[PDB]
Amino acid sequence: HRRQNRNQEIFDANVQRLKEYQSKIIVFPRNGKAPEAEQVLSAAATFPIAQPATDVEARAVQDNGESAFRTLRLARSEKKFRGIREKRAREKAEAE
Amino acid sequence: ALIENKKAKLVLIANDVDPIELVVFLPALCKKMGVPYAIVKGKARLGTLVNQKTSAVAALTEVRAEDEAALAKLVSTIDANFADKYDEVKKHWGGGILGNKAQAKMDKRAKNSDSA
Amino acid sequence: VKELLKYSNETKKRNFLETVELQVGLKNYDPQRDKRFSGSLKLPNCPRPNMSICIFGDAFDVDRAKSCGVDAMSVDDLKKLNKNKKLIKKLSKKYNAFIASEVLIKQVPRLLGPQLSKAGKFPTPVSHNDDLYGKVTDVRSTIKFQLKKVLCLAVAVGNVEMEEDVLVNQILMSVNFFVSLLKKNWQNVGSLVVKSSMGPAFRL
Amino acid sequence: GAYKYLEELQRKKQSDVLRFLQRVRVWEYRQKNVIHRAARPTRPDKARRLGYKAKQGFVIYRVRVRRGNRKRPVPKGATYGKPTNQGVNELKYQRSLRATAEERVGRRAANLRVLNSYWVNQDSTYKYFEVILVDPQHKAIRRDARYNWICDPVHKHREARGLTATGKKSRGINKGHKFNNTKAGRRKTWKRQNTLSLWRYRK
Amino acid sequence: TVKTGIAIGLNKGKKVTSMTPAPKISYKKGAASNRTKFVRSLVREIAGLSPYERRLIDLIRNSGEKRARKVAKKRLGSFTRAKAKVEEMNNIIAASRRH
RNA sequence: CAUUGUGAAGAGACAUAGAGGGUGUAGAAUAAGUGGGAGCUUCGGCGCCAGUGAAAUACCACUACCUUUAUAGUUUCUUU
RNA sequence: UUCUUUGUAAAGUGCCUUCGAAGAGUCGAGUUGUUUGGGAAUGCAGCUCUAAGUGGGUGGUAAAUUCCAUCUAAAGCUAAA
RNA sequence: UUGACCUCAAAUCAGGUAGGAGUACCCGCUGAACUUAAGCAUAUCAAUAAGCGGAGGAAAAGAAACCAACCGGGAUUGCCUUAGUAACGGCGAGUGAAGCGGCAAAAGCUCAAAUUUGAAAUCUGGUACCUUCGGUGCCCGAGUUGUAAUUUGGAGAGGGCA
Ligand SMILES: [Mg+2]
Ligand SMILES: [Mg+2]
Ligand SMILES: [Mg+2]
Ligand SMILES: [Mg+2]
Ligand SMILES: [Mg+2]
Ligand SMILES: [Mg+2]
Ligand SMILES: [Mg+2]
Ligand SMILES: [Mg+2]
Ligand SMILES: [Mg+2]
Ligand SMILES: [Mg+2]
Ligand SMILES: [Mg+2]
Ligand SMILES: [Mg+2]
């Protein structure tokens, strides 16, 4: 009851898990026949956890000249010097 | 809850409740909701009224037409005794009453100082 | 703002028991401590005339001295060995030029009674020699204050009604904001009485 | 309901009405015994909040305990040890005055079970508490499945084992990183991390 | 508030399609209800003020809200509670003037 | 500090009105002030363009500092 | 396998609207002592002070300001490893 | 005068319950010193031994006022690991956890705070009967200073429609 959903993929995976569980199980009526059904011992082993495939193993090289290291360095720099830049912008704004 | 819903026509509050904080808010609540209240002697009397031992409070919320006029002429005096005197009893501190020997002592000192 | 024009609109004309020069001062209250850093300052911008009786010992003696005659009041040259010790007494403002930079000899024995010494309070060695003469000669205190405060200059003469003392007030009465701290109040020109010699007393 | 008004009014402890009423009740409680049975709870809202129900088998006792520190019971202050243990006066008891109050009440009434306790009054010398007790032999508690868990033998002297609210508070039983020493039991965790775990095939 | 896609920076993390889940009711524990507002106001009228609240009232009247907040922070625990107590005392003062 | 409440007074202190007087020098006066410039006035007294002195002097427009005192709100102590 | 029909009872589910009560000598703060790996103070306890309700607690460097995240204390029960 | 109510008593009153033992393990309180530091006082030994109180077959804890800072997880407990690490420490001697991850086992919930108000619907006890770990009828009593039903924040409640 205490976890929330922020990820549509995880939510859809769990919903698909529930759908296939409801298809795979049979519920006996509360009163009568009890239709003997040859139990299995591990719902976890009948519904294994699958790691999602993230990408395909072969693609085309999409290079456009940013080197992927200048990017990291610039992100670190603007995070480091964010608040100083807003302070400068504020004092420039309240400069009359 | 009846007072909060303004369904009460007349409230009687017993005066000898041993935690007085069970009923100290009831007069102010009745004055705020505009329902008339009366502080009455005897939670035991209210208990015999409602077939209990004590009741500590009672309320008429809807009366029959045979004595609604009696209710009106009664409440016209009850509200004059309590509700209209509420904003002046709210300011007056009771108590501070000395014993018999101390009262005689202080008034003896008074008629000692009354030399003129 | 002090006055859109409220309570001070035409009540300097119907009190004309004295049509003579009616110069009313502006005094109001704010204390400060013992230092002499940032007290009474502030030559402001205020366009009314003063029709004063002042004198200017303006020092420059090229034949523009009688151009200083139409710019100012009197001309002084630097013959200073025995000119003055006890003369300069009736004055609103003074002014000098390119000659009076190194006149220390004529300086402490006479410029100490009223203390008009050329320190950072009295910048008379002036090159700018035609704009701060007829309009700025008006009453505006550039003095040094007491242990508490000095605020006094006339806002208007009796012949000048206050159609201009609605553009003078808050070009002027943002007074000590450009240097001082806010130990003072926010525009502490408050309770005022306009009274030159015959004007009545009105209160906020 | 009036219980909301009472709970809001009980928080105005320095209002003139509550301080006058408190000043009367503290004298009335000094004049009685140190432990005495109250006929009905002084704060019914607080009692029924903590679990009291006005039915047969619920008992309210009132108890006063002496305030202040625990003087170390040693003759003439001589502790016979290193100077770090020479403290006698300003040492503080690790359980609360509320806890020892309800323990003394539980010793007085051993046939009852302590449910909760609550502060009613105090002065410079004493603190005053009202202890809620429940009789685990009355049939109204043997039945009435909402409360018959107290009839279990594991609930004898909950206040002596520190299982009441103030007992768990003073044991430090709370979730969080601030309670890593005392979360499942202080001595339990100490044993758990001072034991030596040796396997058959030594890792 | 969407992520950048890389491992550092201002909004680092993997870009995933969000959901905005349903709001929990326990996130509204401190919300004031009509009944509770009514009860608290009535109890305040019939109970009055405490001694430190009265000295806060006269401190606000005489020596200003800065010293009032200082005394309230010394009396209560925190500066936040001092500010809240001082502003509700200001509202009390305004209501007493309007009364 | 709490236990610890109820009253009277007195002393303050902080707020609120009013009140008076103050050094050398010398102008025209025991001169602590202000920007201004000569006027309202029973005086033509006082100031003015006049002398001169650290300062202009009617005048405060606001008090530079008091307590030497009075009315009411707050609190800090003392006595009972 | 059999008898009683529980039950004009109870429970669940969709949409709209009005609401939505939630624990105080407690939380928190100061100080003292003890304790902790807890370090401008981890927990506990004594004394003093003592709350709020878009609030409160926590976010491992004290404090102010602006945000954000995460739960909902001061009441309680519960097998197995 | 009579009858209540509240509070407090007394009974070899009716019916019950507590003590004490054991204590390996468990929950607390209290609480050292020898020792090590090549001395010794903080420290360490040790939040240990002794002392005291209280339970069960397990106890305790437990369904977040949690961990986190991530694409977030999700009661408690225990094991492997984190880790002899972050940190504490005459920063000396020494001491020293926790989150994540894998696994064992898995289980969730309920009161207070609402007017039943067109009906205290609730319950102990006594007594008669019966199919007796209890049930039905009757009679006192408890209880409105609140026993039942309804709801527990994950929600939920009151109306309206299907
Ligand atoms: Mg003691
Ligand atoms: Mg100890
Ligand atoms: Mg500590
Ligand atoms: Mg438990
Ligand atoms: Mg010893
Ligand atoms: Mg040994
Ligand atoms: Mg040694
Ligand atoms: Mg040795
Ligand atoms: Mg030795
Ligand atoms: Mg032992
Ligand atoms: Mg258990
Ligand atoms: Mg250790």
Description:
This is part of a larger assembly, with chains A (96 residues), B (116 residues), C (204 residues), D (203 residues) and E (99 residues). Chain A has 96 residues and is an all-alpha fold. In chain A, 46% of the residues lie in helices and 0% in strands. Chain A starts with 7 loop residues before the first helix and ends with a helix. Chain B is an alpha+beta fold and 116 residues long. Chain B has helices spanning 26-33, 43-49, 68-81, 86-89, 100-113, and strands at 10-14, 37-40, 57-60. In chain B, strand 1 (10-14), helix 1 and strand 2 (37-40) form a beta-alpha-beta unit. Chain C has 204 residues and is largely without helices or strands. Chain C has helices at 68-71, 169-172; strands at residues 57-58, 74-75. In chain C, strands 1-2 form a two-stranded parallel ribbon. In chain C, strand 1, helix 1 (68-71) and strand 2 form a beta-alpha-beta unit. The longest helix of chain C has 4 residues, at 68-71. Helix content of chain E is 58%, strand content 0%. Chain E contains 4 helices and no strands. By secondary structure, chain E is mainly alpha-helical. Chain E has helices at 34-47, 51-62, 65-75, 79-98. At the B-E interface, helix 1 of B face helix 1 of E. The complex binds magnesium ion (12 copies). The site of one magnesium ion has 4 residues of chain D, from loops. Chain D binds 3 RNA strands through helix 1, helix 3, helix 4, strand 3 and helix 6.
Q: Please, how many helices of chain D?
A: 8
Overall geometry of chain C comes to globular
Distance, first to last CA of chain D: 65 Å
Bin the helical content of chain D: 25-40%
Q: How many β-strand stretches of chain C?
A: 2
| Percent of residues in beta strands of chain C | under 5%
Roughly what fraction of the amino acids of chain D lie in strands?
A: 15-25%
Structural class of chain D: alpha+beta
The chain pair forming the largest interface, with residue counts per chain, is: A-E, 14 and 14 residues
Tell me about the largest β-sheet of chain C. 2 strands, parallel
Shape of chain D: globular
Question: What's the number of extended β-strand segments of chain D?
Answer: 4
Main structural class of chain C: little secondary structure
Radius of gyration of chain D: 21 Å
Rg of chain C is 19 Å
What is the terminal-to-terminal distance of chain C? Answer: 13 Å
Family (chain E): Belongs to the eukaryotic ribosomal protein eL36 family.
Subcellular location (chain E): Cytoplasm
InterPro entries (chain E): Ribosomal_eL36 (IPR000509), Ribosomal_eL36_sf (IPR038097)
Protein name (chain E): Large ribosomal subunit protein eL36A
